[PDB]
Amino acid sequence: RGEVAYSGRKIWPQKHTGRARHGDIGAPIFVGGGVVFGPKPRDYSYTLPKKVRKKGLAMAVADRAREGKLLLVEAFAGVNGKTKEFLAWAKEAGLDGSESVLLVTGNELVRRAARNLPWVVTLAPEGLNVYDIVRTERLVMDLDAWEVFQNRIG
């Protein structure tokens, strides 16, 4: 009611008009008045413990490992940037697109080729995060991304 555009004038006298008492028309009891306890710009972030984050990371990968949904690869045969190239590689690797896949690799050309597939989410290893792991039905990592992961939960 202080931030609203109206004057602070008392709209009519306190007593003897036969109307209810009022002050200015910005009060929240008026149509067009200020709002009581409305939202204000707000920071929702908070510092979750680092050890909780790191342990969550390891558990999320463990969960896929225990399901058999974690697959590591040395190299992406001949995928050089084209989505069709990654699709061929995926088929031979058993990724027929019936399951969503989180693809973690530092190879840019592999990420650019897979990323437009509706069933693939692509990450560089330094961006491995548990929400993205739990989002997807399968985990597919470079041996290089795997070592970055192992360095981070250590």
Place this chain on the structure above:
Amino acid sequence: PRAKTGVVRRRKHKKILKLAKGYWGLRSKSFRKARETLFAAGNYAYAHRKRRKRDFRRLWIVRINAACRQHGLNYSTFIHGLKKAGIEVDRKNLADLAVREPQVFAELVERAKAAQ
């Protein structure tokens, strides 16, 4: 995010107005007067289903009383006779018997006069 009233209050008001169909004037047209009328209505129904049990027992007793006095005794002596005879036919069935089966009620009167 904002959560304006929307549909919620209209729907609550229609539930109440629907329960108030048949009420006089604004008691079926105004949400406020209908709600006030229903407050009373619910208490009455509660109080009156308690009361209905007494209303009917009163009717049975009155009919039983007249049936007895056609055979020369009154209700209280009749009931006492039934208690000494060990007869446990309740007042709802006794009043039915007094109307629908006068030969059986005449017998029951016999048992009662004889049980004293």
Place this chain on the structure above:
Amino acid sequence: MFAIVKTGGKQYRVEPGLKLRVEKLDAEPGATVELPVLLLGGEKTVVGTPVVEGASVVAEVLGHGRGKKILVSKFKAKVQYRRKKGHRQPYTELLIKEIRG
């Protein structure tokens, strides 16, 4: 012939062929049950003191149900006290098979 039976804490005049709702009984639908008799009437008159020793009524339980909902509503003025309860009374439905006098 008619009989006055007692079930569910209450008394009913029953004749063969009568369908009747009584308080819920623990009896499978389709089964038949025997109701105790307080009085026989019609042809002969038998008076129980209180219940007739030999007599019984055979009834086939047709099924169980829940009665039409009753709104139990409580309100106390000037005290913001309101209560709304929905009540459905269970019942067993009986077909009166015979008066075994």
Place this chain on the structure above:
Amino acid sequence: MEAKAIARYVRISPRKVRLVVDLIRGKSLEEARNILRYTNKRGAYFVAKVLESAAANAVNNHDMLEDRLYVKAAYVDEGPALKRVLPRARGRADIIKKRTSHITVILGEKHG
């Protein structure tokens, strides 16, 4: 078969015109015309107009016979009111409502 006409937004108060419409409901066309002709009410002019428009619709659009026509239904509904300021004493302003009317006449055929 029915024939109808509506005069919408007639600048007259519904309560006033209804009194006149009630005069001709259920009448034969000819009997309604005589009544409306000698009804000493402003509303007689407007109802007559709608009555004749319905009759014309019956004969010219809907294959009905003028000599069979009767007022099968008739009703006045209220339109948007024109709100006007009426100045009073001591600086107070009242609001006059110059009400308006939607006049419906429906004619049928009385057989025989």
Place this chain on the structure above:
Amino acid sequence: AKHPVPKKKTSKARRDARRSHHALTPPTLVPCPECKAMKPPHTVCPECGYYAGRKVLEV
């Protein structure tokens, strides 16, 4: 005086009951013996100008 004022809003029932005497009576009309037109009794006929069996005005 001290400005008498309605104590309660009049119900729809009571408003409309007061109006039970408001229905118009239809205009009384007799036939003109000359031109057969319907017209009020005891007036010069407005359709043909006759009254008492003779022509009184131009119509």
Place this chain on the structure above:
Amino acid sequence: MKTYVPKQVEPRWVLIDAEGKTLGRLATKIATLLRGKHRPDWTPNVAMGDFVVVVNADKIRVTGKKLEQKIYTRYSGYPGGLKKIPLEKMLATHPERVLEHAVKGMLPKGPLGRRLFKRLKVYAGPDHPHQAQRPEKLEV
């Protein structure tokens, strides 16, 4: 089972001789007959009792000094409009009203109660004009 509700019955006309009987002790019985509470099928929301004819209502009797001291009272609605009439004068002027008043006060208030009062027919003198109804004489 539901409680028996009677279909419309032909009512019973009865004749009572009031001579020598005690005003209020006779009236309680007449009201019982009017309500039909002597009947095994009594129902409180219908007029199903007897029609009661009374003769020799002017010969009704009363104990103590009531002939002089019992005061009937009528209020006209005007200032000073409380009229007091003693039993004596009422018996000398409208004797049938003495019993009529006693019975009316013993009937329920309301529309049915007023209807029941119309089923009571009270006559001074030994005669009544209801021979066509052939009333059954009651000793009460």
Place this chain on the structure above:
RNA sequence: GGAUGACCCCAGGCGGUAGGGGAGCGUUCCCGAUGCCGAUGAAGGCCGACCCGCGAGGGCGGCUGGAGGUAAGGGAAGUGC
């Protein structure tokens, strides 16, 4: 009892203002969702004597409407007159 909220049986408590505690319903929005329901008809509206729920409510059916809506499970509030 059986082992654990699986359901049953027995017993007992269950008036309530200020007020303490518990369990739920619904509204707006986010994840779920590149999904799913949808012109063979979304949301909203109007009916219902039907079904489920103690209840707040939730279904289902007929009509209207004509393009949106959004599950199990969780998250956040401009959340119920």
Place this chain on the structure above:
RNA sequence: GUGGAGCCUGGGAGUGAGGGCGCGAGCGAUAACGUCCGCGUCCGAGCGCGGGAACAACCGAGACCGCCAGCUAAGGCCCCC
């Protein structure tokens, strides 16, 4: 004496205008639907139920829901009833 008993620690209160009645006193006039304490009680919060013609606190009695079943309480049983 196993009770919505008690004790200990801690979280959240609300209340700090009472009122009638019985008994015991003071004040008052061996006045007040008066006033001020004490013991108890009810209403407050049981303006829910029966009785008392009607009626917070007098008598009866502590309303979880349903029944067209039965026994009682105070109070009643000539008619209203």
Place this chain on the structure above:
RNA sequence: CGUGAGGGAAAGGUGAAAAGAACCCCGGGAGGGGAGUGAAAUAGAGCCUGAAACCGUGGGCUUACAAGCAGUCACGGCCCCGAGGGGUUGUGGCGUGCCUAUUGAAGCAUGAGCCGGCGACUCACGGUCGUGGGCGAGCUUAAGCCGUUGAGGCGGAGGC
């Protein structure tokens, strides 16, 4: 609106496309009835949806000897949909509106004409208990920095 400084509104939506209704009919016109357009015209411009108060027309039941916080319990009559139910209400029983404030209100104490929509326990930082987890003689980072472009990591100054 105010002399003036100054105050300060309301008011969005046809349809996919104007195809925005030629022409005829009643009417001075307004308006309407046909024709015609459209998947749809109670989408016809006073235009999406179209609640409620409020006002009509038609129909069912009911009402002029009756005592009323307007209901509720019972029974009966009539009407409707097909051992049942819906509507209505004649009679009988019972029955002191809602909220607020009070020792105490139906109260002749407050507030409310009625309806619809707006309308009041929040947020930041700190604190104190409780609680779900992480780690444990330790626990934890802040500003920043690097990365990301709804990716997280680093950073021990400092705090307990």
